[PDB]
C-alpha cells in the first residue's frame, strides 16, 4: 500500500503544486491524552485543478521535486476555508512571539 | 551465490554446527537466509544430525551450492537419494 493521507490545501502560490495540511491524532506515548499533531505535504497538481480550501486525498508517489513526493489523489470535499484560516492565523501570530520588538 | 553450509554455535571445545542457507559472503556465523537442521560432530546424543529434507531439496533446486562437509551431511540424510528401477 502506497500511503494515502487526507488534508487541506493551504497554498496555490507554487507552480504545479499544492501544500496539503494533514492532521493525525494519537495517544500521547506517556500521558495518554489524544494529541493532534500535523504535517505539511507538497503535492503534484499537474492541472492546477485543486484550489485552496479543498480537502484532498494525497498518495505516495515517485519523487517529483526535492520536497514533492506525493501526488494529489482525488477531491474529498471542496470549499472549507475555516481550516485554512486556522493555518493562517496560527502563522500570523508567529510574527508576534519574537524579541526584536512589538507595537501598540 | 547462495550456499548451504555450517555455522558454528558451540562453545570452546564444544563445536555445535547449524546447517543454513546464506549468501556466500556473510560472516561464518552471520544473518542466514534459512536454517535447515543441526549437526553435532561429536555425537553427544542419539540425534546428532537432522536435516528437513524437502526444504534443502528446494534450495538445491534453485542452486544453492553446498560446501563439501555439508553435501556429505545432506547426503547422509538422503537429500539426494532416488528410488527403485
Amino acid at each position: 500500500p502506497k500511503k494515502v493521507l487526507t488534508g487541506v490545501v493551504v497554498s496555490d502560490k507554487m507552480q504545479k503544486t499544492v501544500t496539503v495540511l494533514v492532521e493525525r491524532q494519537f495517544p500521547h506515548p506517556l500521558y495518554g491524552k489524544v494529541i493532534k499533531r500535523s504535517k505539511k505535504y507538497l503535492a503534484h497538481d499537474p492541472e492546477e485543478k485543486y484550489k485552496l480550501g479543498d480537502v484532498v486525498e494525497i498518495i505516495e508517489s515517485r519523487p517529483i521535486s526535492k520536497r514533492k513526493r506525493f501526488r494529489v489523489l482525488r477531491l474529498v470535499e471542496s470549499g472549507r476555508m475555516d481550516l485554512v484560516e486556522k493555518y493562517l492565523i496560527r502563522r500570523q501570530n508567529y510574527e508576534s512571539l519574537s524579541k526584536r520588538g512589538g507595537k501598540a | 551465490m547462495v550456499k548451504i553450509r555450517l555455522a558454528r554455535f558451540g562453545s570452546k571445545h564444544n563445536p555445535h554446527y547449524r546447517i543454513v542457507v546464506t549468501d556466500a559472503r556473510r560472516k561464518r556465523d552471520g544473518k542466514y537466509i534459512e536454517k535447515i537442521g543441526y549437526y553435532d560432530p561429536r555425537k553427544t546424543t542419539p540425534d546428532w544430525l537432522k536435516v528437513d529434507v524437502e526444504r534443502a531439496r528446494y534450495w538445491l533446486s534453485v542452486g544453492a551450492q553446498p560446501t563439501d562437509t555439508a553435501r556429505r551431511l545432506l547426503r547422509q540424510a538422503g537429500v539426494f537419494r532416488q528410488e527403485a528401477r
Partner: protein, 124 residues
C-alpha cells in the same frame, strides 16, 4: 499540573552533579604535592589535620586528606588520590591512597590494614 500541561511542558528530569570532578570520571588520579601542611578542623572539633595540596594529571590543583597515624609526604611526593570527603575539613573532597607511589603504608598498623597499605606482619 493538568495533563495538557504535561503534554505541553513535560517533566524535568534531575541532573546529578559530580562531587568528584577532579578525577575526570576515573576512580583515582596521580599528582605531585605542592603544600603538605596541617590544617585546623571545623565546627565543634579540635585538632591539627594532615593535608596535602596536589597537582593532578587532570590539571586541577586540589587538596587531599592524608589518612593514618603519621606519614611521610613532601614537596614533590608522587601520590595517588581517591574519592572520599572529610566533613571537618571543608574544600577537601579527596583522600590520599596509602602504599602507592610515594605514600608509605602506616608503620605499625595492625588492624584495618588494607585501608592503609600495610602488609601482613609475620610472627604476630
Amino acid at each position: 499540573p493538568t495533563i495538557n500541561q504535561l503534554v505541553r511542558k513535560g517533566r524535568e528530569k534531575v541532573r546529578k552533579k559530580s562531587k568528584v570532578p577532579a578525577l575526570k570520571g576515573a576512580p583515582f588520579r596521580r599528582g605531585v604535592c605542592t603544600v603538605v601542611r596541617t590544617v585546623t578542623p571545623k565546627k565543634p572539633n579540635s585538632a591539627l589535620r594532615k593535608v596535602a595540596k596536589v597537582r593532578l594529571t587532570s590539571g586541577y590543583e586540589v587538596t587531599a586528606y592524608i589518612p593514618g597515624e603519621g606519614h611521610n609526604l613532601q614537596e614533590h611526593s608522587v601520590v595517588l588520590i581517591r574519592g572520599g570527603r572529610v566533613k571537618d575539613l571543608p574544600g577537601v573532597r579527596y583522600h590520599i591512597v596509602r602504599g602507592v607511589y610515594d605514600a608509605a603504608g602506616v608503620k605499625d598498623r595492625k588492624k584495618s590494614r588494607s585501608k592503609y597499605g600495610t602488609k601482613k606482619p609475620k610472627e604476630a
